[PDB]
A paper describes a structure:
Here, we determine the cryo-EM structures of mitoribosomes isolated from human cell lines with either depleted or overexpressed mitoribosome assembly factor [name], allowing us to capture consecutive steps during mitoribosomal large subunit (mt-LSU) biogenesis. Both the GTPBP5KO and GTPBP5IP mt-LSU assembly intermediates reveal several trapped assembly factors: the [name]-[name] complex, [name], [name], and the MALSU1:L0R8F8:mt-[name] module.
Furthermore, the GTPBP5IP mt-LSU structure features [name] and the [name] elongation factor [name]-Tu. In our GTPBP5IP structure, the G-domain has GTP in its active site and is wedged between the L7/L12 stalk and the MALSU1 module. The Obg-domain protrudes into the PTC, thereby displacing the A-loop from [name] active site and expelling the [name] N-terminal α-helices from the rRNA core, while the A-loop folds into the fully mature position. The partly unfolded H89 in the GTPBP5KO is folded in the GTPBP5IP. This folding is coordinated by the joint action of [name] and [name]: in the presence of [name], the extended N-terminal region of [name] inserts into the rRNA core and temporarily displaces the P-loop, thereby breaking the P-loop interaction with H89. The GTPBP5IP structure shows a rotation of the L7/L12 stalk in comparison to the GTPBP5KO structure. Thereby, the L7/L12 stalk stabilizes the “state 2” conformation of switch I. In this way, the rotated L7/L12 stalk stabilizes the GTP-state of [name] and consequently, a GTP is bound in our structure.
Residue numbers in the entry:
A (entry chain d): 36 to 52
B (entry chain A1): 27 to 108, 123 to 384
C (entry chain 3): 94 to 188
D (entry chain D): 61 to 297
E (entry chain X): 87 to 171
The structure:
RNA sequence: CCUCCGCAUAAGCCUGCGUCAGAUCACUGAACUGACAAUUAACAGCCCAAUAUCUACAAUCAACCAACAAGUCAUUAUUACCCUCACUGUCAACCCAACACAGGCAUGCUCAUAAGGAAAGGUUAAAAAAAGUAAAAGGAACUCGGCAAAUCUUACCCCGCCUGUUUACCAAAAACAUCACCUCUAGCAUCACCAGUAUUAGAGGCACCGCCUGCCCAGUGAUCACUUGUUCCUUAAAUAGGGACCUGUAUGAAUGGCUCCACGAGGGUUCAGCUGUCUCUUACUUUUAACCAGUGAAAUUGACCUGCCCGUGAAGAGGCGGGCAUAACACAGCAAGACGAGAAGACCCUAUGGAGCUUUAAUUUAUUAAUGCAAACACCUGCAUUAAAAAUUUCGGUUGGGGCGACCUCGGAGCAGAACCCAACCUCCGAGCAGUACAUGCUAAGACUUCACCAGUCAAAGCGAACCUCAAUUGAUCCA
RNA sequence: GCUAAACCUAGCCCCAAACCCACUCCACCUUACUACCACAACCUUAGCCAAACCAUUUACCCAAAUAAAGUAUAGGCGAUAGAAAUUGGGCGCAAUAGAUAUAGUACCGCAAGGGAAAGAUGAAAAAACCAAGCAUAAUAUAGCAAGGACUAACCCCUAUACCUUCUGCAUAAUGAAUUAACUAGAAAUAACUUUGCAAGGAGAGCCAAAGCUAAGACCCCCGAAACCAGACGAGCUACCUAAGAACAGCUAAAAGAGCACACCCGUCUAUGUAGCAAAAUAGUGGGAAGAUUUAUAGGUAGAGGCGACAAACCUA
C-alpha cells in the first residue's frame, strides 16, 4: 500500500549552453 | 445470502438423531422399562417363518419342526379356550434364548416360495381381525406387505383391497404377491391393487367393508435407528413430523367411514410414541362422533394378551388396545394394535 | 494439431483419427457405431443390427477428418484383396 | 563460518583461562540452542576429575592438603584447590571441606572396607556398601562423569564378584567395575536449588535469554485414530 | 543416477533415484610388483580377477575403458615397465 | 540581538569561499571557469628471534566493612642477538539523507562562553489561517470524552503482580516476556548443548508471593480367612473343577477458585480547584496575507465564444425544448455546482487467475530414523515394511435476507384450445425395473427423429422355422 | 520576428571467405594494481508453458543437403512425440534507424546489477519560405463554435464534440493539453483463378479413373499477480560474538529504588500533508546504574536467517 518515487536521470538538468 | 455463521449446529448422523429423540421422550414414558427396550432395539430383530398355504405346507411344517422351531399360533389356539382368532395361519418361531436365524426362503415344487420371513409381532393384528369366510377386507396401507400376505393366507377373504400412496412401494408389494400367491387366486378383482390417497377412501367408498386393517405411517422406530438413508428423523425432513400426527387421524377415519355398521377395524402402529398410539385413536373417534356423528366402541384385548403371554411380552400400562415391547429373550418389532367396531 | 513440426516443419496427422476411421479415395469416410460392443443383453435385435453396420460421415465431419490427416492417407492404394475395393470410386453421380 | 573454538589449551594449568561465549551458535554460525546470550564474562578453571593421578615419576596412594574452597562461575558445585608433593590442581569440593583439611587418594582395593571418611577417593571395591559417593567413572582411568553437580550423591547398592551397582541421583542403576574410583560424600553447595532468582535481570546475568513469544498447542502429536473407530473421536455435542 | 515411477506404473509420481554399488576393502598381491595392496573393490572386480586367474592378469588383459580407474592404469603402467625393462 | 553550541580527535569525504585573471534574488561577482600555490613529525599509524616454562587470591580513593553476576592488564631458564630514526596520514566552510535539506551522527574539553552566530528584501496593517498575551460576571453550562489551555487535586472500579518488550511509517495495550510454580525428554566426552553431568541440560505450559481445592491402590470378615480378578492344569468342549499369582510399591492437578501490597503515558467513574472549553466573544503582537522589486514550481487540461427557471433525459443539463436575462475588461474573497482534482480501490461478483496457512483433500516417500530379509564377513550396498518430516496439486455448477439446505439425468402431473415447437423459474408425482418368450434368428427396399453431432425409432420383400407387455426403466471413448 | 526547421556521414546489420588476440620498464590473489619469510576441481537441471484444470505426459545441436515420412512406432492410445534400413556481395539502416555504444562512459544501486543522450559551414576560417508556442495585433449581448447566407465580421435561421464498451446514451462510462517522430495480420490443408503439358504430369523420391506442374491470393499489438535456476545482499534492521565507552545534581538502608540533566524512546495535542522531512516540527510526556544506551570489527541468507510472536525485521 506504498508507492516509491522515481527520479529522472540527472544528465538532462545539467545541460549547458 | 450470508455465507458465514457464528455457530453452526453439529452434524449428527440421522440414526443418532433418532436415538436422541427416543432418549429424551421414551425415558419419561417407560421409566425403568426403557433400558431393556433400548438394548433390544439396538440388538438384532428375531424373525418368524410364515408358511405359504398355497405351497406344500405340510412338508415345510415338517422341515421347520426338524430345525427345532415351533408354530406359536397353533399352541396359542390350544390354550385359547382356557369373536374368534384368524384361522389357517402358520408362522414358526424359535423358542426364547434361541437366537438362530431361519434359512432364507427358496422356491418350492409348485414354483412359489415355501415360507415368508417376517416379525411375528406384525402377524398379531391379522389375528386380531375376526375373519370369517366371505368377508370383504380393506387394507389402507398395504405396501410393502407382510400383513397383506397373511390376510391372503387366511383364505377367508372374498375380495382384497390393497392401497398405498407410493407406487415405488406398491411395486415391491406387486412383486411379492405375484411370487408368493399364484395367479389362480388373483383372478378378477378378488385382489384389487390401487395406488391412491388413503384419505379419499372415506368419501370414495362407504359402508363397503366388514373388515379393515389400518397400518398408518409411523416413525419406524427400529428402522430409524438402523437405516441411515431416507430417515424420517433426518433434520431436513423435520417438517414432515409436524404434519405426521394429523395424517394418522385422517387415515384411521377413512377406514371408519368405509366400514360396514358393526364392521371391525383394527389399527396398528410400528412405534411406541404415545402421541401416535392413543392420542391418534381418541382424536379420530372424537372427530367422527362430533362432525359426522357415528358411534364407535373399542374392545379390550386383555383376553388376547393372556394367550400370547408365553410367546410375547406386553406393556401393561396401555389404556386401550395392546402394545408389544422388544425384549432380548423374545425379540419382536415394537408395535401397537387395537380393535374397534362402529356401533352404528 | 501440429501445423509445423519442430524437426521437419511439416504437418502432422492425428493418429486418433487413423485408428477409428477409413477414408475412401472418392472423399467419403467410414466409421463404426458407438457402443456396438456395449451391454448387448438389454438391446433389441434390430437395435443390435443397426449397431453392427459401417456408416458414412456427413460433410463437416468429413472436412474435419481431412484436415486432421495428411495427404499420404488420401492417395490411391492398390491392395491385393481389400474388401473395400469397389467403394473407392463413385457411379452415376450427377452433383 | 570463521569460527574457532576457545578450547585450544593443551597444558594443564591452575590459572583462570578466558572463555568465549557461543550464543548457541555452531561452527556453521546458525543458532542450534535457544535462550543463550551474553551475561557476565567468565574465566574457566580447569578441573582434574581424574582424582587418582600420581605425580610425574611417582606411584602409589598419595595425599593432598586443601588450601582454598572458592566459588566457580562455570558450575554449580564449589571447587577446592589442593596441593601435594609439588603439584597444585582444582578439584570438586564435598560438603565439609574447609581450608587446611587433608585428603587421601588411593587405588588400593582392601579385603576389608576402608575408612568411610569424606572427601577422600577410593576404588568402589574398597568402599563399603550403602555409602554416599560422588564423581564416579564408568570405566577405569576414564575420569568422573556422573555425580558431579551441587549437592548430588549416589550410593553403592551391591558389590558382587567384580561388579558394582551404583544408583545415580535419577534413582537409576548403573554397572561399573571395582577398579574404578569414587570420592566419598555429597557435593558442595547444597540448597543450590533453594536459591531464588529474584527478577528477570538475574537470569539475563547468568547468560540466559527469554523463552519465545510464540504459542504452542502441544509438543506431542495426538494418538492416531484407527479405521474401526473414527466416529468415536471428536463426537460433537 | 536416474528417475523412477513410484510403483512400476507410469501413471504414478516420478522420483529421483541413485543406485550405488556395494564396496569392500580387500587385499591383493601383485607378482610382478611383488607388493601387497589394500584397495576398495566390488564383487564384480573380484569375479573378474577370478576369471582372469590373478590380479596381474586382470590388470594386464583389461583395456583402459573397462578398468575405469586411474590407479588401475598406474598398476598397469608399472607392470608393463617392469616387463619391458 | 541569539547561542543545547563551540574547539579538537575519531569515522566519513577528497582540494570542495587561498592568490591572480576572464566570466556571469543580488554585486557584473563568486561557493563559476582556468592558471598558480599548499598539508614539513616530536602526535598518530606501521612492531617484536626460538624452544620449554610460569601466571589461585577482582574493580570500586582499596583502607574498615560488604558482597555477587566472580571479574581488562605479571614470567623464569637457556640459546641467538650490536646496525638507527626509513615509510604513510597532516588542507577546507567537509559526512549519511536526490538539494547550501527544521532530519541522522561516537568520544574529550568548555556548561556558557575568551568560541560561534543573525529571526526582519521594501511597504501596508483587509478577510480567512497559524502561534502567542490579556479579559467583566459566571466556572464544564462545551464536549463522545475537561481534548486543549490551564493548573500543577481526592477517593475508587476493571484488567495486567511489578522493571521490561512489541507492529521502523495509522495500534504501546488488557498482547509478549517475567521472578515463582508445573509437564515432558535425556545416564552422557574433545566444534553447539559443554571443556557441562539429574540440586544438570533441552523442549513446553502458566505467570510472583498468600490460602482453599488431590485419588477407579479389591471387597467383606479383621496383620489374618473367604469372595473376586489374572494366569495356567483340566474339560470333546462348556454347566466347572483343580493348582499358581496379586503386601520387595503408595497416591495424585503442564487441575480450578478467592483475597491482598506495590506499580501502569492502560480503560471507566468521582471530590476540590482551575481556567475563553462554553454562555458569548473581544483586543493587541508575531507569522501569514495584500501591494512594489528579483527569482520562479506542481497536480490538472477533448475543444470551449463556459448564464438563470421550468420541463425532458425515469434519477442526472452551461450546451436538448419553452421562457427569462444579457456592452467589454482586471483585482480581492467564498466554497453551493462543474457526479471538481489525486491516489497500490472500501464493498459484491467473476476468472476451469495467483499466493500464505491448516488438515481426517488427492497423489507420493525423493530425505531422515527404526525394523526385517539378502550381500559381506560393527559399518556399507540392494530389497521390503513402519513412522517422522516434507513435496506437488485442487477446492464443479444452479438456487437460497434471519440459516443449520434443496437440487444437477429420464418420464408425467397445473399451465398446453386445432400441423410441429413453446407457460420460464418454481411446487409436486414417479424411473434406475419387473414379468413372458427363447427364430429377443439372419438379411434387406424406403422412411421417422427431441430442433447440431452422437445417440434413438419404424419397416416391405427375401433365406430358415411355426401352424411380447410396459410412460421413463438409462451411460460414449480409452482401458481391464 | 523569435523559438525553431532543414541536412549526410560517422558507423552499423546480414552473408561469404578465413580457424583468433593474447603484447616496452614497474606493479598487481594481503585491503588487487602493495619489492623483501615455516586448504583445494569433477556430482540426473528445474520450472514457465501445452493439455483450454491438473497429477503420467508436453519439440529443444549433436555432426550429408533431398527423399524414405509425419511412415513404422510411442502416448492420461490425448495433447502431442517420432525413427531407421535405404537413397544421395546486398529490391540492407542512415542519428528516435542501424549495435546499448561518441560508451559499458556519465549517471543509478552496498553489491550482483541497470544504463543514457547527442553531431552537421565552406575548396579554404592563415576568408529567402514551412510544426506546435508565441510576437507583429486583448476584448463587445447569444451559447460543440460551424453551416445556409449576406452589401456587410457579428446580429437572422438550422445544428445534443470524437473514440471505445453496452440494446438505448443525448450524457452515463473509459481515453485524449498540443505538435513532430515512432508504434500493431506473420502460415498450412483443401478449394478458386491464370498458365504449360496431358492419360499422363514433375529437372529421381510423389500424385494420377483428367490429372499433374507453376504462380497468384488467407491467419495482429501492448499489459499481470506468479513459478523455477544461478548469483548478490546483515554499512538499515533482528539476534549473537570479540574487545571497548557513557550515565551531572538531589533524596535514599540502599534496591531491574524515587525526583531529575545529558542520552534513549515516542503518550497526547496542534502544525505539516509534492512537506524542512518518502514520517518532520513545537509543546507535553515514558525510562534515565540497567533485561540500560552507544562507537568499532566479525557472524547467521531466502525450500533460509532472525524473532521478550507484532506474521515483526532481513538496505525507504
Ligand atoms: C407403516 S407402512 C404399512 C405397514 C406395512 N405395509 C405392513 O403391513 O407391515 C404405511 C405406508 O403407507 C404409505 N402412505 C403414505 N401416505 C399414505 C396415504 N395417504 N395413504 C396410504 N398410504 C400412505 C407410506 O409410504 C408407508 O410406507
Ligand atoms: Mg520458561
Ligand atoms: Mg508463551
Ligand atoms: Mg611517536
Ligand atoms: Mg564572536
Ligand atoms: Mg536573515
Ligand atoms: Mg516580506
Ligand atoms: Mg481573523
Ligand atoms: Mg473571565
Ligand atoms: Mg455537559
Ligand atoms: Mg451539551
Ligand atoms: Mg490534558
Ligand atoms: Mg504490566
Ligand atoms: Mg506503527
Ligand atoms: Mg521500536
Ligand atoms: Mg503509536
Ligand atoms: Mg500473558
Ligand atoms: Mg512499564
Ligand atoms: Mg492567496
Ligand atoms: Mg512578485
Ligand atoms: Mg503536478
Ligand atoms: Mg433539471
Ligand atoms: Mg458540461
Ligand atoms: Mg476570482
Ligand atoms: Mg480491484
Ligand atoms: Mg487455478
Ligand atoms: Mg460460477
Ligand atoms: Mg406439465
Ligand atoms: Mg434431428
Ligand atoms: Mg423374408
Ligand atoms: Mg494447462
Ligand atoms: Mg489458452
Ligand atoms: Mg542510436
Ligand atoms: Mg541507444
Ligand atoms: Mg507556426
Ligand atoms: Mg443562435
Ligand atoms: Mg468486455
Ligand atoms: Mg461521465
Ligand atoms: Mg552489524
Ligand atoms: Mg528485540
Ligand atoms: Mg530507576
Ligand atoms: Mg524514574
Ligand atoms: Mg498474535
Ligand atoms: Mg493475526
Amino acid at each position: 500500500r506504498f508507492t516509491p518515487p522515481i527520479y529522472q536521470p540527472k544528465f538532462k538538468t545539467e545541460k549547458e549552453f | 445470502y450470508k455465507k458465514k455463521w457464528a455457530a453452526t449446529e453439529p452434524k449428527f448422523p440421522a440414526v443418532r438423531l433418532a436415538l436422541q429423540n427416543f432418549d429424551m421422550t421414551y425415558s419419561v414414558q417407560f421409566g425403568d422399562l426403557w433400558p431393556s427396550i433400548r438394548v433390544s432395539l439396538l440388538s438384532e430383530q428375531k424373525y418368524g417363518a410364515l408358511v405359504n398355504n398355497f405351497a406344500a405346507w405340510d412338508h415345510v411344517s415338517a422341515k421347520l419342526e426338524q430345525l427345532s422351531a415351533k408354530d406359536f399360533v397353533n399352541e396359542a389356539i390350544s390354550h385359547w379356550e382356557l369373536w374368534a382368532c384368524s384361522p389357517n395361519l402358520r408362522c414358526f418361531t424359535f423358542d426364547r434364548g434361541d437366537i438362530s436365524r431361519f434359512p432364507p426362503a427358496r422356491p418350492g415344487s409348485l414354483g412359489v416360495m415355501e415360507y415368508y420371513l417376517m416379525d411375528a409381532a406384525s402377524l398379531l393384528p391379522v389375528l386380531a381381525l375376526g375373519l370369517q369366510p366371505g368377508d370383504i377386507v380393506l387394507d389402507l396401507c398395504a405396501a410393502p406387505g407382510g400383513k397383506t400376505l397373511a390376510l391372503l393366507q387366511t383364505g377367508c377373504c372374498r375380495n382384497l383391497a390393497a392401497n398405498d400412496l407410493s407406487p415405488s412401494r406398491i411395486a415391491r408389494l406387486q412383486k411379492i404377491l405375484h411370487s408368493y400367491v399364484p395367479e389362480e387366486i388373483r383372478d378378477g378383482n378378488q385382489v384389487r391393487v390401487t395406488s391412491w390417497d388413503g384419505r379419499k377412501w372415506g368419501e370414495l367408498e362407504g359402508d363397503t367393508y366388514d373388515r379393515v386393517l389400518v397400518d398408518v405411517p409411523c416413525t419406524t422406530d427400529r428402522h430409524s435407528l438402523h437405516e441411515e438413508e431416507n430417515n424420517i428423523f433426518k433434520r431436513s425432513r423435520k417438517k414432515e413430523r409436524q404434519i405426521l400426527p394429523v395424517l394418522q387421524v385422517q387415515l384411521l377415519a377413512a377406514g371408519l367411514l368405509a366400514t360396514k355398521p358393526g364392521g371391525h377395524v383394527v389399527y396398528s402402529t410400528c412405534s411406541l410414541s404415545h402421541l401416535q398410539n392413543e392420542y391418534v385413536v381418541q382424536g379420530a373417534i372424537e372427530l367422527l362422533a362430533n362432525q359426522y356423528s357415528i358411534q364407535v366402541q373399542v374392545e379390550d384385548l386383555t383376553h388376547f394378551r393372556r394367550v400370547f403371554m408365553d410367546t410375547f411380552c406386553f406393556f401393561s400400562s396401555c389404556q386401550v388396545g395392546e402394545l408389544v415391547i422388544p425384549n432380548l429373550m423374545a425379540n419382536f418389532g415394537p408395535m401397537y394394535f387395537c380393535k374397534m367396531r362402529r356401533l352404528t | 494439431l501440429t501445423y509445423f513440426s519442430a524437426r521437419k516443419g511439416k504437418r502432422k496427422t492425428v493418429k486418433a483419427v487413423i485408428d477409428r476411421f477409413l477414408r475412401l479415395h472418392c472423399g467419403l469416410w467410414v466409421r463404426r457405431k458407438a457402443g456396438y460392443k456395449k451391454k448387448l443383453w438389454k438391446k433389441t435385435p434390430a437395435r443390435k443390427k443397426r449397431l453392427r453396420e459401417f456408416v458414412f460421415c456427413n460433410k463437416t465431419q468429413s472436412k474435419l477428418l481431412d484436415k486432421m490427416t495428411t495427404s499420404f492417407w488420401k492417395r490411391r492404394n492398390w491392395y491385393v484383396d481389400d474388401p473395400y475395393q469397389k467403394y473407392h470410386d463413385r457411379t452415376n453421380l450427377k452433383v | 563460518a570463521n569460527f574457532v573454538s576457545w578450547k585450544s589449551r593443551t597444558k594443564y594449568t591452575i590459572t583462570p583461562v578466558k572463555m568465549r561465549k557461543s550464543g548457541g551458535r555452531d561452527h556453521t554460525g546458525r543458532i542450534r540452542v535457544h535462550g543463550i546470550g551474553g551475561g557476565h564474562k567468565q574465566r574457566y578453571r580447569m578441573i582434574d576429575f581424574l582424582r587418582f593421578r600420581p605425580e610425574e615419576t611417582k606411584s602409589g596412594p598419595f595425599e593432598e592438603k586443601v588450601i582454598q574452597v572458592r566459588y566457580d562461575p562455570c558450575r554449580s558445585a564449589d571447587i577446592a584447590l589442593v596441593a601435594g608433593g609439588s603439584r597444585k590442581r582444582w578439584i570438586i569440593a564435598t560438603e565439609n571441606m574447609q581450608a587446611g583439611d587433608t585428603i587421601l587418594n588411593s587405588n588400593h582395593i582392601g579385603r576389608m572396607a576402608v575408612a568411610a571418611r569424606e572427601g577422600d577417593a577410593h576404588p568402589l571395591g574398597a568402599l563399603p556398601v550403602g555409602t554416599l559417593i560422588n564423581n564416579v567413572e564408568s570405566e577405569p582411568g576414564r575420569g568422573a562423569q556422573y555425580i558431579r553437580a551441587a549437592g548430588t550423591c549416589g550410593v553403592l547398592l551391591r558389590k558382587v564378584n567384580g561388579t558394582a551397582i551404583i544408583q545415580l541421583p535419577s534413582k537409576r542403576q548403573m554397572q561399573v567395575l571395582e577398579t574404578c574410583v569414587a570420592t566419598v560424600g555429597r557435593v558442595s553447595n547444597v540448597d543450590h536449588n533453594k536459591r531464588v532468582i529474584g527478577k528477570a535481570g538475574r537470569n539475563r546475568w547468568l547468560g540466559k535469554r527469554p523463552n519465545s513469544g510464540r504459542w504452542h498447542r502441544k509438543g506431542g502429536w495426538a494418538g492416531r485414530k484407527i479405521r474401526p473407530l473414527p466416529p468415536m473421536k471428536s463426537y460433537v455435542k | 543416477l536416474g528417475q523412477i515411477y513410484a510403483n512400476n506404473d507410469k501413471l504414478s509420481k516420478r522420483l529421483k533415484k541413485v543406485w550405488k554399488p556395494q564396496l569392500f576393502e580387500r587385499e591383493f598381491y601383485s607378482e610382478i610388483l611383488d607388493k601387497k595392496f589394500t584397495v576398495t573393490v566390488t564383487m564384480r572386480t573380484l569375479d573378474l580377477i577370478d576369471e582372469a586367474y590373478g590380479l596381474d592378469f586382470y590388470i594386464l588383459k583389461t583395456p583402459k575403458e573397462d578398468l575405469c580407474s586411474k590407479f588401475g592404469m598406474d598398476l598397469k603402467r608399472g607392470m608393463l615397465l617392469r616387463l619391458a625393462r
